Structures are given as structure tokens and as C-alpha cells.
């Protein structure tokens, strides 16, 4: 379960003079009441901070407890959420006088690393970005709009984001400071401090045992979200309006992610991460393999009744987001013959071979001249290679044979020549695909017939249990399905 905390900021001078009763009432350190006797709603949280709360105290009951596990290779996230003016920028990046949770987090992390130098070697890689108007901008080095890309292996990565390697507490705190100044913050007369963008500081820890008698890696994300803005309550226009819209949409996106994640009864069901760049960055940080803490900031005043209620409903719902945690852990003439075979240079092939080039050379992936020639439709080089001792059934590190490749790309003549030279019609690659599967998927009907004529097994199934027939059915490919019908 994700950890959720509430920070009730002290009433400002604007709220004091009004003299409207306080809606937020702190009973226990766990319990808060929303609209006391009126709704009178009891909320249970992991921690609750009153108006007299210091930065140290918030830090003491948020990040500080998790910094041990971070060092032991556990992903961490702190995200400040809540309405405008509730005090999330105060909490996260602090004032000139009073340092925020980010500062304190980083200060204590480096102290910890210094105390355990003799037992463990630590290195940190850091980045600081801004989500502004559905665009990501690096806050450390002024890089342009950056693209967000996703693999099922590395997760979501920000392409072009500069990684820095601070070695002391004073170095990392300098980057923090550099970014805080680069962050888009517009000084308005109405609102002195209002965030226009979402600040995301990331820390990548690599940790090894000092004697190495297995490296532990972890990502810590510190997020200061901008708050939503009613275009009526504020009255924004121009660039400030667009800012408000983009922010509100990101928060809509975040809202949907929280709801879909929480008490979902549907872990098999889709989560709309891609609805916002913000929710894409936070994908690995919301209820996955991550210790996440929400600092939900609220005003105590009646003036922000609805705003406060909205925050609390979402904070409360975030508690139901479940997380499963885990500590992270030949020849020179060969190269030339490969390239030559790929490029379909018949003459260069002959010459390279005449000089004794290994016809069965492999690249880093285990591809041979025959594979490459078969792929890129160079019939003449295919014949030449086969005539001089090429392994017609060679496999790369992925199990692809020449025939797999000729079938995929749809080179009919090559497919025939391969078979006539004893290609395995039913070779299986690492994906469980045969030549038939590939020719089927790519809608090469003449190749399918030829493969079948040469004894292709119509009953062979891929990793997902699909035969060529199954594929044709699941595709509404009647032309294909018709031929496979027996």
C-alpha cells in the first residue's frame, strides 16, 4: 500500500482577517476531520502534520525513514499533491531561510553514504526536469523539448535528459539549486509563488559491497506538482491560461490514474498513463515496485473548502494503491563479406570470397552472409554462397534461419532456392515462429502455398499457442484462412 500524508499549512494573513472557522481539524497523528460539527468526515492517514509543523518534522516522517531501504536498492518516490497555495513548493523546495524536503533528503542521503563508505561503495546519477505545457525540459542544462520513450525493459525514459554525477552533498545541492532557478516561475502581483510546471528531481543510486565478497540500483523521484487553477477564481488569460489548462489536464490524467489503480478490482485493466507526460514519468512510481509517499497539502480555511475536500478524497483513495516491493539487481574479411552480402554487391562478394573470406562468418547477432542476402533479396549472392558451403540452416542468437527471413520479407525465388538446398521448412525461432507463421502474418500468399507444398507443419504453434490458421482467423484474413482450411 502507498503511503499518504497530509500537511495542513498555517493560515496566512488573508485567512486570519476573514475569521471563517477552520474546516480541517487534527485529532490524532493518524486521524483528521474534514468539516466538524456539516459533513464531519473522519480520515485516517499514515501521518498528519498540523500548522506548527516544521520542515524537519515532515522530513522525519516521510523520506528519512525510507533512505535506508533506498540504499538497500529499493525505489522511492515523494510527490507533493494538492490545491494552489496549499504549500507543496514550500514543503518540497523550501524558502531562502527554511530548506525543503528535497534539500533535507539529499543532505541526509550523502551523510548516510559517508558513514558507510567502509562497508559499501555508492555512486549517484541525478537529473532534474520540468513538465511544462505537456513538454519536458531539462532544468540543469538548457535542453529543448525532450521525447518520452518506453521499453518493457527500461520502462519510461526521457531521451536527451542530461545525467549528472555529483560525489558530495554540496555538489548535488548545487544542481538542485541550479534547477530551482531555471524552473519556469512567473512573478505575478496577485500570486507571488505559483508553480507553472511540475518539478521532478530523480536520483539513480548504484551500490556495491565494498569488497564485493552484485550491484543494487534504485530510483528516487522527488516531485513538486503545480496545482490546478480555476480560470474563474483566478481569471487567467494569455500564457497563464494555457498554463492552467495544461496543468488541469495533467491533474485530470493523474486523477484517472489514481482511480484506476485504486481498489480497481481490475489489475488486468488498462491504466491511462499516456494521457499526460506527467503520468508517464510517474508510471513506475505509482503502486509498482516503488515505495511511494504522497504529501497531500491542504489549507485549513473554509475559503478553500471544495479545494481541500478534493485533495482529501484523492489522498484517501491513493492509500488503496497496492505495491509489491523488491530490491533491484573473427576475421577482417568476414565483416566485409557480411556488409557486401547485405548491400547486394555481387562483385565485391566474388572478390572477397576469392581472397578466402569466411562464407559462414557471423556478426554480433549471429547473422551470416546467407541470412543477410536472403533478407534483402539478393538471389545471386544467395546461390553463390550456397554453392560454396554456406550453412542453409544456420541460426542467429534469436533462432532465425535464412528461410525465416526470406519468408518474412516475401522473396519467393529465394525461398525456393533455400528449400531446394535443404532448408528446414519447420525451423522454430525463439518466438516459436516457423517460416509459415511469418509468411502468414505478412500476407505473402504465394510463399504460404510454397511452404505448405514443401511440408510446412500447419499445426505448429508460437509462444502464444497460435498456429498459422489461428492467425488468419484472428486477422479476418479470409484469403489466407481459406487455403489453410485443411
Amino acid at each position: 500500500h502507498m503511503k499518504v500524508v497530509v500537511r495542513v499549512r498555517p493560515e496566512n494573513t488573508k485567512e486570519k482577517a476573514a475569521g471563517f472557522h477552520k474546516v480541517v481539524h487534527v485529532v490524532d497523528k493518524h486521524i483528521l476531520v474534514f468539516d466538524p460539527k456539516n459533513k464531519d468526515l473522519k480520515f485516517v492517514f499514515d501521518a498528519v502534520f498540523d500548522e506548527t509543523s516544521t520542515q524537519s518534522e515532515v522530513f522525519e516522517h516521510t523520506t528519512k525513514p525510507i533512505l535506508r531501504s533506498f540504499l538497500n536498492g529499493y525505489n522511492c518516490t515523494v510527490l507533493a499533491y494538492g490545491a494552489t497555495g496549499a504549500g507543496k513548493t514550500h514543503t518540497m523546495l523550501g524558502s531562502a531561510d527554511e530548506p525543503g524536503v528535497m534539500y533535507l533528503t539529499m543532505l541526509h542521503l550523502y551523510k548516510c553514504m559517508d558513514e558507510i563508505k567502509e562497508e559499501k561503495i555508492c555512486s549517484t546519477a541525478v537529473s532534474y526536469l520540468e513538465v511544462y505545457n505537456e513538454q519536458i525540459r531539462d532544468l540543469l542544462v538548457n535542453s529543448g523539448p525532450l521525447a518520452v520513450r518506453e521499453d518493457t525493459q527500461k520502462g519510461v525514459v526521457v531521451h536527451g535528459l542530461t545525467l549528472h554525477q555529483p560525489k558530495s552533498s554540496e555538489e548535488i545541492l548545487h544542481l538542485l539549486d541550479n534547477g530551482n532557478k531555471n524552473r519556469t516561475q512567473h512573478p505575478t502581483d496577485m500570486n507571488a509563488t505559483s508553480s507553472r510546471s511540475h518539478a521532478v528531481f530523480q536520483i539513480y543510486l548504484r551500490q556495491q559491497d565494498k569488497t564485493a565478497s552484485n550491484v543494487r540500483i534504485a530510483k528516487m523521484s522527488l516531485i513538486d506538482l503545480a496545482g490546478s487553477e480555476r480560470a474563474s477564481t483566478s481569471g487567467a488569460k494569455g500564457t497563464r491560461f494555457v498554463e492552467g489548462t495544461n496543468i488541469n489536464r495533467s491533474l485530470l490524467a493523474l486523477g484517472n490514474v489514481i482511480n484506476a489503480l485504486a481498489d480497481s478490482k481490475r489489475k488486468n485493466q488498462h491504466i491511462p498513463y499516456r494521457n499526460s507526460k506527467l503520468t508517464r514519468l510517474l508510471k513506475d512510481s505509482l503502486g509498482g515496485n516503488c515505495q511511494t509517499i504522497m504529501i497531500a497539502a491542504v489549507s485549513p480555511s473554509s475559503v478553500f473548502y471544495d479545494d481541500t475536500y478534493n485533495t482529501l478524497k484523492y489522498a484517501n483513495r491513493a492509500k488503496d494503491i497496492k505495491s509489491s516491493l523488491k530490491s533491484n539487481v573473427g576475421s577482417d574479411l568476414g565483416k566485409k563479406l557480411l556488409e557486401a552480402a547485405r548491400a547486394g554487391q555481387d562483385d565485391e562478394v566474388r572478390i572477397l570470397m576469392a581472397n578466402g573470406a569466411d562464407v559462414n562468418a557471423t556478426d554480433a547477432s549471429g547473422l551470416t552472409p546467407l541470412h543477410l542476402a536472403a533478407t534483402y533479396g539478393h538471389l545471386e549472392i544467395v546461390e553463390v554462397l550456397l554453392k560454396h558451403g554456406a550453412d542453409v540452416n544456420a541460426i542467429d542468437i534469436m533462432g532465425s534461419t535464412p528461410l525465416h527471413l526470406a519468408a518474412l520479407i516475401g522473396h519467393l525465388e529465394i525461398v525456393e532456392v533455400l528449400l531446394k538446398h535443404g532448408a528446414d521448412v519447420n525451423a522454430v525461432d525463439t518466438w516459436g515462429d516457423t517460416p509459415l507463421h511469418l509468411a502468414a502474418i505478412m500476407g505473402h500468399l504465394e510463399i504460404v502455398e510454397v511452404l505448405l507444398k514443401h511440408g510446412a507443419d500447419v499445426n505448429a504453434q508460437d509462444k502464444f499457442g497460435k498456429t498459422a490458421f489461428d492467425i488468419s482467423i484472428d486477422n479476418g484474413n479470409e484469403d489466407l484462412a481459406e487455403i489453410l482450411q485443411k
Binding site: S228, E229, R230, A231, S232, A236, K237, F241, G244, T245, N248, R249, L251, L252, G255, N256, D306, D307, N310, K313
Partner: protein, 436 residues
Amino acid sequence: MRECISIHVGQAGVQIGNACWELYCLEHGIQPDGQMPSDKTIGGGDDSFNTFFSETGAGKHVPRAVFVDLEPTVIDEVRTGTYRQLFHPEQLITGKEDAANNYARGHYTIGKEIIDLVLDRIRKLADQCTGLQGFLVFHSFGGGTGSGFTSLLMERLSVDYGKKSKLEFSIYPAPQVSTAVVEPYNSILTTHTTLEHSDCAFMVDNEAIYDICRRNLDIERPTYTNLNRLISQIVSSITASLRFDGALNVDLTEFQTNLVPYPRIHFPLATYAPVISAEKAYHEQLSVAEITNACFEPANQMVKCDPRHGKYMACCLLYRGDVVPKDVNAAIATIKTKRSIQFVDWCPTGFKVGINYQPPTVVPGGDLAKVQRAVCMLSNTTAIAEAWARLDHKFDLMYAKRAFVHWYVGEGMEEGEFSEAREDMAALEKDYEEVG
């Protein structure tokens, strides 16, 4: 006497306005050019119809009306039409583009461009008034302008004219005529945003009017023109007292007094009779008794609900035409013996009565037969909660999925405004539950 200003917002508001003002002119003997032969005092006057019409030195009678739409197409028809010379041109305000069925576009993005201009034009009208009572506001729930812009207007009027009354004629959506899937959203948002700024709101269910037109008027496929004519007859009955110096509902404040004991529960159900085809004009004229009883037949209601299984908070009966007071008292005394009626604890069992002696008027195109006597019942019943429920339900279906919500948020709304709006509606349904 004391003047009332009419404001018409969006297509529905405007097109209803056309039908109302046409009917008003017909009722007071005013011509399309604003010339009223029967008015002998050319300069001005303290007359009853002057609540709704101002007077120019050329003997021209001018609606105390503002027409507002965010796109020009509809108001352009007014500007080019039979009744173009009726209005001062400044009273017909248009923008460049509409709100695209989006409350937020009407309330914020597009609406904020024109709001100040509109208030200036309204102010021009208020300055020609010796004692302004307040405003009658006509709009759809379902339109982007009807919902979003009305809300905005009502907010600004609460500030600029704090002590003035504000009454709505609101068009509740029906699938039969609707052209936007998001009409449930627009309706709820505008109900919540408007609630604290409105004294009394007369809802007209498009489905109800459609039904009446089909059933009673034998109209195969009702157009807006057909709907509007019927609506205008109901508006006319409601505003008659304001325009003909009656004894019941003599001013705007009295509507609240007579219909709204509890501020938030300010939605009277209108029932109207008789609605008869001209193809049946030759029939025997219906009596006071017959039309009074037709006020309790559900098929004659302006909003679909069941008052028989609900409780009344107030009930006015507004008679028009050849109506003898004693016959009214007879009919009303008789209603008790039909045992249909049940009132809330803290409220009196009285049916207030208004009689005006002006026979109903039908317009040139009308399908409605001219009758000697007609009645409109205004009853504040808890049954109308059923209308909110149906509407709240459709909201819930979509909002659960956040369907279409990005369109509103993309216009500078927070998701939270949907929650706030829906919760106020849940409270309103509870309000109706409690008084039961």
C-alpha cells in the same frame, strides 16, 4: 409600474424570445414596427404593459429585452425578420463563434470576451427604468451558451444588481430534439452554478412539449417553431399578471413569496390547459371546471413527473379569459373531493388564484385553437425531483468513465468542478426528500 428586463441566451433562449415577444405584441395590440394605435399617451405612460415595453417619442413600443448568442446565425434572423424594427439594434448582441456545446467555452473561454459588453447593454436598459424589479432569463440547459454563459451572466447580475429579482425559463433537454451527447454535463454544471443566483426557475421539458404537440395538436414531427409557440403560451400565462396589472403575482418578488418557501427548492411545475387543435375549434367550449381538472392530468405538464405521489409546497392557478370568479371557487372547492392533493407539514393547503379577463391569443402560424378560457397551474411539488434524478443519472453514467471530461478541462475547468456540481445536485435531491 415597475419594469422587468428579459434576457435571452443562446439559440433556445432567442428562439423562445421570438415566440414570446411576437405573442406579447399580439396581446397588447402592438405591430411589428412597435406602433400601438390604442395607446393615447405617446411620450411614455404608467400603464401595465409598460413593465415590458418602453416608449420612444415617435410612439414606438420597444421590448425591455436583450438577445445574446455567441454566434450570429440565429440573431441575424431577428435582424432581417418581420420584427427587426421592434428592437434597438444594441439589444441584439452576437459574437463570432459559439461555445460548441461546451459549458466551459460558454462560461470562460468565449463568454469572457463578450460578458462586459452584454452588461453595458443591460445597464443601458436599467437606466431607462424608474423602478427595476429584476430579470427574466431564457436559456437552454444543454447548449454551451445556454448553460455556460447564463451561469456567468447570473453571477455578474448578482453583483451588479444585488437586490433585484431573477427568474429563469429553462429548457430541459430531450433525446428527441437534442444534438449533443454532453447535454447532461451542461445541465448539471449550470444548475449548480446558477442555483444561488436564481429566485424562481420555470423548467420546460422538451419531451413534454414534444408529446403535447404530437398528441393534442396532431403534429407529425414537431419543429422548434411548433414547440416555441406552445411554450410562449405558457410563458405568456405566467407573465400576464406583470403586463396586465393583476391581483396575484403583481411583481417579481411575489413569485418567490407565492411559490418558493425554501430558497433552493425554487422549481415550480407548470401545467397548462386547454391545448386543442384548430381542427376541433367547432367543439363546445370547455368550462372552468373542465380546464381546472385538466391541470391534474400529467399529460398536460411542462415537466414529466408524478405530482400525485409527491407533496405540494405551493399552488397558484392562473386563469385567463371568460372566467367568472365564482366558477373558479367552485372548481377549487371541488378539487379536495377528488382527493388527489397532499401538502407538506409547514405549508398551507391554499390554492392561490389569479384571474385576468384577456382571452388567449394565437399567432398566425399557430396549430392551437383559439379558446375563450385557459388556465396555467404553477405548483411547487417534490415530484419535480424526478426530473433532476433522470438528469443526474445520465450525468453519473458518463462521469464514472470521465467521458468527454477532457473537453471541459481543456477549457480551463478543474475535474473538481464536476464533483462540486454533482454533489450540490445530490443535496438538492435530499432537500426534496426531507420536505416530504
